[PDB]
Scaffold this motif. Structure first.
Motif, PDB file in Angstrom:
ATOM      1  N   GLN A  41      32.828 -17.601  41.001  1.00  0.00           N
ATOM      2  CA  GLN A  41      33.329 -16.239  41.202  1.00  0.00           C
ATOM      3  C   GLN A  41      32.438 -15.204  40.518  1.00  0.00           C
TER       4      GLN A  41
ATOM      5  N   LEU B 269      33.694   1.588  27.875  1.00  0.00           N
ATOM      6  CA  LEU B 269      33.177   2.902  27.495  1.00  0.00           C
ATOM      7  C   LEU B 269      32.793   2.894  26.022  1.00  0.00           C
ATOM      8  N   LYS B 270      31.623   3.460  25.744  1.00  0.00           N
ATOM      9  CA  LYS B 270      31.037   3.607  24.419  1.00  0.00           C
ATOM     10  C   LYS B 270      31.638   4.793  23.671  1.00  0.00           C
TER      11      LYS B 270
ATOM     12  N   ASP C  18      31.457   7.796  20.375  1.00  0.00           N
ATOM     13  CA  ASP C  18      30.632   8.945  20.038  1.00  0.00           C
ATOM     14  C   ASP C  18      29.416   8.551  19.204  1.00  0.00           C
TER      15      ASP C  18
ATOM     16  N   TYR D  29      34.956   1.058  23.171  1.00  0.00           N
ATOM     17  CA  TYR D  29      36.365   1.435  23.207  1.00  0.00           C
ATOM     18  C   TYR D  29      37.238   0.249  23.604  1.00  0.00           C
TER      19      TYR D  29
ATOM     20  N   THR E  21      39.491   0.277  25.790  1.00  0.00           N
ATOM     21  CA  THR E  21      39.663   0.293  27.237  1.00  0.00           C
ATOM     22  C   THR E  21      38.550  -0.470  27.950  1.00  0.00           C
TER      23      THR E  21
ATOM     24  N   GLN F  46      34.743  -6.823  40.513  1.00  0.00           N
ATOM     25  CA  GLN F  46      33.900  -7.836  41.124  1.00  0.00           C
ATOM     26  C   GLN F  46      32.537  -7.256  41.460  1.00  0.00           C
TER      27      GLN F  46
ATOM     28  N   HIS G 152      29.305  -6.694  43.700  1.00  0.00           N
ATOM     29  CA  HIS G 152      29.184  -6.510  45.138  1.00  0.00           C
ATOM     30  C   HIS G 152      27.920  -7.224  45.594  1.00  0.00           C
TER      31      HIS G 152
END
Lengths: 36, 50, 50, 50
Positions: free
Chosen positions: B4, B11-12, B14, B29, B31, B36, B38
């Protein structure tokens, strides 16, 4: 003749968006060299 | 080689620093964004992942 | 102007195809020029109206 | 996400009716033509499967 290097270069402490204008500036430079 | 194909996007924080990117893992971060892959291209650069 | 407007014509609310409105509100907030820190601040909120 | 990406192809019997195709499974013929997926495209329609 007396002279002094008062090359002011202020920039914000937060350097995240401050380069966002640079992307448009290079895209503009690309458009000026491309049409002219 | 894996069955697969996939990749995660984070996200980085400051004050970006390449040395911190290879030195510490706290710059990223909490988050995350799995997705997948492409298709690889690498038309001009050797790393043009989507 | 920033992006081309046919993509707005491709996904319309009257087509009833927006089964997942949060993707549309995210696509529309993506058009903002705000700092990635400001995007992370929008992500820090939990309640939908907030 | 499945290990082997695939899609089947079957043939419909006489007097096609979409409501019976989604309601009952007898309209389609028992014959079938299974095949592995290549790559999605969706150039104009949102469903262009090869």
């Amino acid at each position: 003749m007396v002279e002094v290097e008062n090359v002011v270069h202020e920039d914000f402490q937060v350097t995240e968006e401050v380069k966002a204008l640079t992307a448009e500036i290079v895209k503009t430079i690309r458009d000026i060299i491309a049409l002219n | 080689r894996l069955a697969q194909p996939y990749v995660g996007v984070f996200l980085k924080r400051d004050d970006s620093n390449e040395s911190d990117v290879v030195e510490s893992l706290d710059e990223i971060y909490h988050t995350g964004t799995f997705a997948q892959i492409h298709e690889m291209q690498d038309l001009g650069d050797k790393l043009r992942m989507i | 102007p920033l992006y081309r407007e046919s993509v707005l014509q491709m996904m319309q609310a009257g087509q009833r195809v927006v089964d997942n409105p949060i993707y549309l509100s995210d696509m529309g907030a993506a058009l903002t020029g705000a700092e990635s820190h400001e995007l992370q601040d929008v992500l820090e909120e939990t309640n939908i109206p907030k």
